Write a protein that holds these residues in place. Structure first.
Motif, PDB file in Angstrom:
ATOM      1  N   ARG A   1       0.949  -1.249  -0.087  1.00 40.05           N
ATOM      2  CA  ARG A   1      -0.049  -0.045  -0.112  1.00 40.05           C
ATOM      3  C   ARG A   1       0.726   1.257  -0.028  1.00 40.05           C
ATOM      4  NH1 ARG A   1      -4.226  -1.595  -2.545  1.00 40.05           N
ATOM      5  NH2 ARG A   1      -5.525  -3.252  -1.339  1.00 40.05           N
ATOM      6  N   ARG A   2       2.108   1.310   0.578  1.00 35.88           N
ATOM      7  CA  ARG A   2       2.868   2.269   0.528  1.00 35.88           C
ATOM      8  C   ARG A   2       3.466   2.585  -0.882  1.00 35.88           C
ATOM      9  NH1 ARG A   2       8.311   3.962   0.850  1.00 35.88           N
ATOM     10  NH2 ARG A   2       9.083   1.726   0.006  1.00 35.88           N
ATOM     11  N   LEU A   3       3.776   1.507  -1.662  1.00 36.03           N
ATOM     12  CA  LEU A   3       4.258   1.882  -2.948  1.00 36.03           C
ATOM     13  C   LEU A   3       2.988   2.283  -3.875  1.00 36.03           C
ATOM     14  CD1 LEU A   3       6.326  -1.326  -3.569  1.00 36.03           C
ATOM     15  CD2 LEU A   3       7.098   0.972  -3.423  1.00 36.03           C
ATOM     16  N   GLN A   4       1.880   1.829  -3.574  1.00 33.31           N
ATOM     17  CA  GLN A   4       0.649   2.166  -4.233  1.00 33.31           C
ATOM     18  C   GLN A   4       0.447   3.780  -4.085  1.00 33.31           C
ATOM     19  OE1 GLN A   4      -2.886   0.308  -3.224  1.00 33.31           O
ATOM     20  NE2 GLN A   4      -4.248   1.421  -4.838  1.00 33.31           N
ATOM     21  N   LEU A   5       0.613   4.183  -2.672  1.00 35.26           N
ATOM     22  CA  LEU A   5       0.611   5.596  -2.604  1.00 35.26           C
ATOM     23  C   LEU A   5       1.611   6.485  -3.094  1.00 35.26           C
ATOM     24  CD1 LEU A   5      -1.623   7.093  -0.652  1.00 35.26           C
ATOM     25  CD2 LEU A   5      -1.871   4.512  -0.485  1.00 35.26           C
ATOM     26  N   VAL A   6       2.998   5.764  -3.210  1.00 36.23           N
ATOM     27  CA  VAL A   6       4.146   6.477  -3.917  1.00 36.23           C
ATOM     28  C   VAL A   6       3.603   6.751  -5.254  1.00 36.23           C
ATOM     29  CG1 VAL A   6       6.172   6.077  -4.756  1.00 36.23           C
ATOM     30  CG2 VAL A   6       5.662   5.851  -2.120  1.00 36.23           C
ATOM     31  N   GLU A   7       3.083   5.530  -6.045  1.00 33.06           N
ATOM     32  CA  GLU A   7       2.671   5.852  -7.409  1.00 33.06           C
ATOM     33  C   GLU A   7       1.601   6.704  -7.594  1.00 33.06           C
ATOM     34  OE1 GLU A   7       4.231   4.381 -10.058  1.00 33.06           O
ATOM     35  OE2 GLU A   7       2.815   5.608 -11.299  1.00 33.06           O
ATOM     36  N   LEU A   8       0.633   6.974  -6.576  1.00 29.77           N
ATOM     37  CA  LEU A   8      -0.677   7.470  -6.568  1.00 29.77           C
ATOM     38  C   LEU A   8      -0.056   9.076  -6.492  1.00 29.77           C
ATOM     39  CD1 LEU A   8      -3.624   7.547  -7.105  1.00 29.77           C
ATOM     40  CD2 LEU A   8      -4.051   7.273  -4.677  1.00 29.77           C
ATOM     41  N   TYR A   9       0.719   9.336  -5.624  1.00 24.53           N
ATOM     42  CA  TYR A   9       1.275  10.681  -5.228  1.00 24.53           C
ATOM     43  C   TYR A   9       2.096  11.405  -6.555  1.00 24.53           C
ATOM     44  CZ  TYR A   9      -0.494  11.516  -0.493  1.00 24.53           C
ATOM     45  OH  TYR A   9      -1.028  11.723   0.558  1.00 24.53           O
ATOM     46  N   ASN A  10       2.852  10.227  -7.241  1.00 22.82           N
ATOM     47  CA  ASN A  10       3.645  10.821  -8.506  1.00 22.82           C
ATOM     48  C   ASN A  10       2.590  10.913  -9.372  1.00 22.82           C
ATOM     49  OD1 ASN A  10       6.344  10.766  -7.168  1.00 22.82           O
ATOM     50  ND2 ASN A  10       6.034   8.269  -7.163  1.00 22.82           N
ATOM     51  N   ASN A  11       1.612  10.202  -9.749  1.00 24.58           N
ATOM     52  CA  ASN A  11       0.716  10.417 -10.677  1.00 24.58           C
ATOM     53  C   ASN A  11      -0.265  11.654 -10.529  1.00 24.58           C
ATOM     54  OD1 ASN A  11       0.068   6.677 -10.986  1.00 24.58           O
ATOM     55  ND2 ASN A  11       1.463   8.054 -12.428  1.00 24.58           N
TER      56      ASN A  11
END
Lengths: 40, 157, 423, 39, 107, 49
Positions: F14-24
């Motif tokens: 979920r941390r990697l998903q949030l990192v991808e989401l914040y970068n997008n």
């Protein structure tokens, strides 16, 4: 004459709808610039 | 699309030479062709036809047809010569239908020539062997065609 | 004495390298000679400089705009006769426009969610530790003491969370007390906004002020308070015909046994009728905008052509516009096989009406191809304003059919609207 | 119209700005130019 | 071609050799756009687990690893789901023709 | 951030998903506020990201 058959959207003919989002983003930019001016 | 006048102005009160208003019979209208149909004063067979709407509409239709005819004939840089079937080029060796008989026929869809055969115009200088066999002196010179692959001023050389 | 043809700036050299990369990649339209690429690069740099000059002159012209009536500045808007005919909005029209949210409300909601989750975790930790049941007496309710004191919660927050400020820890203690008492409601803060301390009369008593605020907040969010507010707004004539019809339909859905079971309560039988009206009454928190229609796109999957219609004089002018996306940026408009500059006889005030549906959409006209078929009365010339109105309506309906969100500005400009005027 | 109490309720959770489909009221109008003063 | 059990063995071996080695997000998105959502979350969980054990209660936990990738292996080798799984495995890193010889054999 | 009872592989996923989401979201706001010349507002948005 009597323009009752004409719609209400045609009588003032309010054009220029593209500029409103630009004006709002400019207003937000000016608010942040004023916040930068007040702090320094 | 054309923006010239076609209809005649209708019948009403006698107009005066004011702003946005011309008299009903003026020399400016229709090249002055209303001079045949005008009355200068501000015999019934010569007075009733000038006031009929169908008569003046038929007359201006005739005049607009004359204008269309002279502009279509001034476009002509060619003439029709009856050439036999053997000496004609390859695009005309087919069965060409009459006017308004079939679909407007393309010239050669196989050789990537999509154009009307009835609008095709052939040069006189390329048919001197067909039109003039009796002269034998080459009455028209050969057409100088430019070399499209030559390095000229158009191609920065 | 001899001007060097070579690129003179680093920007010129970078654009020349880009043009060389484009020519080596084999892109359609890129020239193969070097002099043409040099001409291209110099013209692009001059275009960038002219764009910068236009931006700077607009920046200067913004400050010298004659906002008042003067010598050459005339109103002529009917502001004297009619007054304020042009609308203006300070809100982004959803979902056509986007303004990012302010950081203060974002940080406030973030901190509120943090405090709520921390208080819920501490309440569940005490529920696991204490072993189940916990009954609160009447004197325990009047003393407003829960299972944990403030000192225990402060010691737990100091032990478990090292990095924690003082006022944040005190707000956490207050929120844990509020969550262990009841489920937390964010109602005291807005009541502190709308009701000041000098109005009720407690200037030197902050504790009784916050007690009255939390009591009014916990009494506000009940069903009976919402029902009484809905009845008060029904008495104040704040409904249209639509709300009356929806209240009638909600009254018709109740049978007699459900009516008796609802009139066993004092406020529920009114609330079943007035639920939608109380949703409307609650303000910008719970009332939705109507909004223009946003439909689905009706595009040919093979050719990519959308079809729109336009009419004028009822019988005389009918037009159908076919619209396609141009990917090479060479977009052009054609009316009955002839280009638009020759159909309307180069008249700017007629072709600007055809340009206008691309303008109000904030769209480039060169990315679209259009052909307009005339279905009404055929005449040798359509160079008039009513034919141009029909052309504008056809192009606007085609743009609405191609991209559906284009209906949001184009309906607001009145370009999709049909007038009924005959001869 | 007349003064009422609509909108005066405390909104729960304070999230009245993130709801972008909210009611925006009737469309107000603004002057394009300041008319000259009467006196 | 010729997949009674050849494609099943191919998919379980390629999934086992692609799960325990690397740690990336290149396998989750292609399973996500293919239509299956739960196995995409599970393989994201496994790749994040492999990243967590690569970046830095030891022996008892790791057996769950040998559970869950095995839970992947028998899931993509059901008799209906061998097809899209082997097609997706052919695109990212698995290039072998020892069990893809049957395509040339049927040609 | 308020979930530690979940296993660490779930938290890192979920941390990697949030990192991808914040970068997008950051790239989307960069592409959205670009033509308005909103460098101050975009600077505050990038500071928040």
């Amino acid at each position: 004459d009597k323009y009752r058959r004409v719609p209400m959207l045609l009588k003032p003919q309010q054009g220029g709808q593209q500029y409103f989002n630009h004006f709002l983003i400019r207003s937000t930019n000016d608010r942040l610039t004023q916040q930068d001016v007040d702090n320094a | 699309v054309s923006t010239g006048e076609f209809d005649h102005p209708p019948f009403q009160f006698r107009q005066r030479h004011t702003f946005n208003t011309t008299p009903l019979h003026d020399a400016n209208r229709f090249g002055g062709r209303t001079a045949y149909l005008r009355e200068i004063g501000p015999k019934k067979q010569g007075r009733r036809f000038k006031k009929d709407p169908r008569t003046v509409q038929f007359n201006v239709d005739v005049w607009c047809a004359q204008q269309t005819l002279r502009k279509r004939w001034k476009q002509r840089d060619w003439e029709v010569i009856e050439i036999p079937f053997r000496l004609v080029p390859r695009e005309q060796q087919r069965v060409i239908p009459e006017l308004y008989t079939d679909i407007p026929q393309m010239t050669d869809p196989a050789r990537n020539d999509f154009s009307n055969i009835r609008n095709k115009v052939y040069d006189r200088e390329e048919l001197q062997g067909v039109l003039f066999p009796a002269a034998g002196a080459m009455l028209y010179p050969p057409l100088q065609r430019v070399d499209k692959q030559a390095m000229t001023l158009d191609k920065y050389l | 004495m001899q001007k060097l043809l070579s690129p003179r700036t680093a920007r010129h050299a970078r654009l020349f390298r880009l043009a060389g990369k484009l020519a080596d990649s084999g892109s359609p339209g890129v020239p193969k000679s070097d002099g043409e690429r040099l001409v291209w690069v110099n013209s692009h740099v001059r275009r960038d400089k002219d764009i910068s000059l236009s931006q700077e002159e607009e920046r200067i012209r913004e400050l010298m705009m004659p906002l008042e009536v003067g010598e050459n500045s005339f109103a002529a808007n009917g502001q004297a006769t009619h007054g304020n005919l042009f609308y203006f909005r300070e809100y982004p029209m959803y979902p056509g426009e986007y303004v990012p949210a302010e950081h203060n409300t974002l940080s406030s909601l973030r901190d509120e969610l943090r405090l709520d989750l921390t208080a819920q975790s501490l309440k569940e930790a005490w529920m696991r530790v204490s072993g189940g049941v916990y009954f609160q007496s009447v004197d325990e309710y009047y003393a407003s003491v829960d299972g944990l004191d403030a000192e225990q919660i402060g010691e737990v927050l100091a032990a478990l969370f090292p990095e924690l400020n003082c006022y944040e820890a005190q707000a956490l203690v207050q929120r844990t007390l509020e969550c262990i008492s009841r489920p937390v409601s964010a109602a005291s803060r807005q009541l502190s906004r709308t009701i000041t301390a000098e109005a009720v009369g407690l200037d030197n008593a902050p504790g009784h002020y916050t007690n009255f605020l939390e009591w009014m907040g916990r009494l506000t969010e009940t069903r009976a308070f919402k029902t009484e507010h809905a009845l008060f707004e029904f008495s104040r004539r704040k409904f249209n015909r639509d709300d009356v019809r929806v209240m009638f339909e909600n009254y018709r859905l109740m049978s007699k046994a459900t009516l008796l079971a609802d009139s066993a309560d004092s406020y529920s039988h009114f609330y079943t009728v007035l639920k939608d009206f109380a949703r409307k009454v609650a303000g910008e928190d719970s009332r939705h905008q109507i909004g223009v229609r946003i439909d689905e796109a009706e595009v040919d999957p093979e050719t990519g052509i959308a079809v729109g219609r336009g009419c004028a004089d009822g019988e005389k002018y009918h037009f159908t516009a076919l619209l396609r996306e141009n990917r090479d940026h060479n977009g052009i408009i054609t009316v009955m096989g002839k280009p638009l500059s020759l159909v309307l006889d180069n008249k700017a005030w007629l072709m600007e009406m055809v340009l206008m549906p691309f303008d109000e959409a904030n769209l480039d006209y060169r990315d679209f191809d259009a052909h307009i078929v005339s279905e009404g009365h055929a005449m040798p010339s359509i160079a008039n304003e009513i034919a141009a109105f029909a052309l504008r309506m056809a192009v606007a309906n085609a743009l609405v059919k191609l991209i559906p969100l284009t209906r949001i500005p184009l309906k607001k400009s009145g370009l999709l609207s049909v007038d009924r005027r005959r001869e | 119209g007349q003064k009422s109490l609509m909108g005066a309720l405390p909104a729960p959770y304070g999230d009245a700005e993130f709801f972008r489909g909210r009611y925006r009221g009737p469309p107000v109008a603004r002057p394009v130019v300041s008319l000259p003063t009467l006196h | 071609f010729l997949h009674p059990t050849v494609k099943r063995r191919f998919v379980v071996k390629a999934v086992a050799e692609i799960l325990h080695n690397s740690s990336s997000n290149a396998f989750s998105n292609m399973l996500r756009e293919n239509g299956l959502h739960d196995t995409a979350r599970e393989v994201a969980l496994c790749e994040a687990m492999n990243r967590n054990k690569e970046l830095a209660a030891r022996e008892e936990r790791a057996a769950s690893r040998k559970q869950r990738i095995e839970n992947i292996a028998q899931e993509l080798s059901s008799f209906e789901r061998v097809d899209l799984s082997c097609d997706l495995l052919r695109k990212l890193g698995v290039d072998m023709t020892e069990l893809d010889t049957a395509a040339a054999a049927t040609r | 951030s308020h979930s530690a009872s979940m296993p660490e592989e779930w938290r890192e996923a979920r941390r990697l998903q949030l990192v991808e989401l914040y970068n997008n979201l950051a790239m989307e706001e960069v592409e959205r506020l670009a033509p308005h010349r909103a460098d101050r507002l975009l600077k505050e948005q990038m500071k928040r990201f």
